[PDB]
Amino acid sequence: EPREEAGALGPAWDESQLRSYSFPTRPIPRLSQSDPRAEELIENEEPVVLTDTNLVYPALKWDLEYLQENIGNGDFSVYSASTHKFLYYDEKKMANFQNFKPRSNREEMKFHEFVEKLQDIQQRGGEERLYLQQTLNDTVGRKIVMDFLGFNWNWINKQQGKRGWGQLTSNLLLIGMEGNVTPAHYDEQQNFFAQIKGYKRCILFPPDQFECLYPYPVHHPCDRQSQVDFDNPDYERFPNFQNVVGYETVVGPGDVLYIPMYWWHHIESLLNGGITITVNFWYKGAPTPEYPLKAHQKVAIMRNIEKMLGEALGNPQEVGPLLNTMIKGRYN
Amino acid sequence: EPREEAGALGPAWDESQLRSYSFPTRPIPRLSQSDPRAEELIENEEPVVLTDTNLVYPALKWDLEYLQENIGNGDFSVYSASTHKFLYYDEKKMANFQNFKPRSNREEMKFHEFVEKLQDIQQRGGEERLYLQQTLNDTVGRKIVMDFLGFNWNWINKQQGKRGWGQLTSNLLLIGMEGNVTPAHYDEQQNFFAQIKGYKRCILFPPDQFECLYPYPVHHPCDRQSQVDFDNPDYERFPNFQNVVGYETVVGPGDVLYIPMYWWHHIESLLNGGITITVNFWYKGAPTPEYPLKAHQKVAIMRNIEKMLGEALGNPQEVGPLLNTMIKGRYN
Ligand SMILES: Oc1c(I)cc(Cl)c2cccnc12
Ligand SMILES: Oc1c(I)cc(Cl)c2cccnc12
Ligand SMILES: [Fe+2]
Ligand SMILES: [Fe+2]
C-alpha cells in the first residue's frame, strides 16, 4: 500500500503513477538502520530500503531554484531523448558496432541552461525528456559543498568498513523529469541509492536471472543492459523473460536503497509526480576470497570469456560465430 | 583409379573393398620426396602422400611370423571391439562422464597371445576385431631394433629441422585386422604415417570443417573424435555434416602420408584385404610466432575456453549450461 506522509498531507503517490508490467514482483524490506536485519541483508548482498540513515539530510531542502543559486557556473552532462526510455550507451564501444545509432544524445551545459530547457519543455507540453547525470567533482558552489560536508559520512564509511568493501568510486547526482525510465541494467559495484526529491520506483532482479534478462553482448555499447523492451517484450527472441520475477519498491525523500553488486535495476520516476533528485554512492566490492559458486561470479566468468574471445580473435564481431561453432551439436 | 603393382601382380585393391559414404572427396597428391611440391605442401601444412621416402624400408619384410620370432616377450597393448569401429576413449576423462560405458575394451598381452586370438577369430569367422597399438619402447628383440635403426632417420630429422618442429614424441606401431575402422578424429601433433603391410584408406578433413564434424566435448573421454556416425549420419543432430568435403587416399607398403596438425583423419583397413601394419611418427608442431587467424588456432581457442570453464566452475558437467546461458538470445 502507498505510504501516508506525516501530518496527513495525503498519499505520497498512487498506483496510477506506476507503469504496468508483464511480470510479478515482491516487496523489498523497508527497515531502520539500527535493525539487525538490515545489516544482515547488506552483508548477504540483498536489497533493503533504509528509512532513517540521514545520509543526505542536508540535501533534502534542494529544489531547482536552490541548486541554480548555489551549484555555480560549471559544466554539467545532460542526456536527452525523444521518449521515456533513457538507454545509456558506452562511447568507447561505439567503434565495436557500426549499425547502431544512439537514440539518446548527450550535451554539456550550464545549470541555468538545463533549467531553461526544463521549464520550456513543460511550458510547451513536449515529449522530450531530460536527465542530469553529473559525477560531483569540484566546480560546485560553497553552499552545496557545505551540504555535501553534512552528509552522514559516519554511517556510510562504517558500512564500507564492515562490508570490507573497497573505495568510494563515485557520487553521481541525478535530476530527471517525471516519467523518466532508466531501463534494466546491472553494475559491477555495490550501490547506495539516496533519494532526495520526488519518488522513484525501483525494480530489482537478482543476478541468477541472467537467463531471463538477456544482456547485450559485452562488446556492445549497451553492455550490461537488458535487451528486453519491458513495455513490449519479445517472447520469441526472449522466451525466458516469461519467467522473470522482480523485487520492487518505491523510494522517496530520505530513503536509501541498497542495490547490491550485480543486481539488475530498472528505475522509473513517477508519472505526473514532478522532477526527481537522487544522489548515488558506488563502492568497489570486497575482493575475492569456494564452491558452490555464486550467480554473480558465474556472471563475472561469462563476461571474462567474452572479453578474452574478442582479444584472441582481434575482432568483437567474431565472438558470436565462434560461440555458436563451439556449442552447435556439441553442448546444446 | 586403383594403382597397378609392379610385374603385373594385379590391381593392389579394388573399389568393392572401400566403404560407401555420404560425402564427396578429392585426391591427396602422391609425390616424390624430391619434388618441390611435396615440400611446399608440408610447410603449408597440407596432406601429401610421399611415395619414395624409404622411411621404413627395413620394416617392409615384416609379417606376423617375423614379428613373433623377433619382437620378444614384452607387454603389448591390445584393443578389442565387437564391431568394425574402434572408438578410442581417454581413461583419465572417464571420471568426467558416468553415463558412458566403453564399447571397445583394452587388454595387455604377449605377441603370441595376440596372434593366438587373431588366428582363432579368423578360423571361427567371428565379428570381433582387434588392434595392436603399442608405443615402441625398449622390450623389443635385437632384429627389430636393427630394423628400427635402419629407418630413414636422415630424411625424417631433416624434415623436423626445416619445419622447425619440436621433438619426436612417439612411435606407435599398429597392427590391425581387415575392415578395421578408426573413426574421424584430429590430433594436436604433426604426423608422418608410414604404411608397411596391407592397404589403408585415409580420409582427411581440414580444420576449417570443425563445424561439420562435431567433436565431442573437450572433457568427454572421446575428446577430439567426431560425434557423427559416418555409416548412419544423424542430419537432425548434425546438419552441417551435409556440407562435409574430404581429401582421400589409399596408402600401401612404402607410402608415407603427411597428416598435418589438427586435420581430421578417418582411417580404414581394406575389407577382405588382410592384416595391416603401420608405424607413425608424431612431432610437436612449430611454436607460435598475426591476423587473419588460421582455422587451427581458432580450434585451439575453443579448446582453451572449454578447459578454462571446466576449471573455473569446478565441474565439466556445467560447461554446457554456462555456454548456452552465454549465447541464448545474445549471440545466436
Ligand atoms: O547507474 C544508475 C544511473 I547512471 C541512473 C539511475 Cl536512475 C540508476 C538507478 C539505479 C541504479 N543505477 C542507476
Ligand atoms: O592416432 C592414430 C591412431 I592411435 C591409429 C590410427 Cl589407424 C591412426 C590413423 C591416422 C591418424 N592417427 C591415427
Ligand atoms: Fe545502475
Ligand atoms: Fe590420429
What does this structure look like?
2 copies of one chain form a homodimer. Chain A is α+β, with helices and mostly antiparallel strands and 332 residues long. Chain A folds into 2 domains: 1-289, Jelly Rolls (Sandwich), CATH 2.60.120.10; 290-332, Helix Hairpins (Orthogonal Bundle). The first copy, chain A, contains 8 helices and 14 strands. Chain A has helices at residues 36-43, 64-70, 111-123, 142-149, 153-162, 210-213, 295-312, 319-327, and strands at 25-27, 30-31, 48-50, 76-81, 104-109, 129-133, 168-176, 181-186, 190-197, 200-205, 246-251, 256-259, 264-269, 276-283. In chain A, the strands form 2 sheets. A 9-stranded mixed β-sheet of chain A has the order 2-3-12-9-14-7-6-4-5, covered by helices on one side. A 5-stranded mixed β-sheet of chain A has the order 1-11-10-13-8, with no helix packed on it. In chain A, helix 1 (36-43) links the parallel strand 2 and strand 3 (48-50). The longest helix of chain A is centred in the last third of the chain and has 18 residues, at 295-312. Chain A starts with 24 loop residues before the first strand and ends in a 5-residue tail after the last helix. Chain A binds chain B through residues 210-211, 214-217, 227, 237-240, 291, 293, 298, 301-302, 305-306, 308-309, 312-314, 319-320, 322-332, and chain B through 210-211, 214-217, 227, 237-240, 291, 293, 298, 301-302, 305-306, 308-309, 312-314, 319-320, 322-332. One fe (ii) ion (FE2) is lined by residues 185, 187, 265 of chain B. Chains A, B: The record marks 323 as: Important for dimer formation.
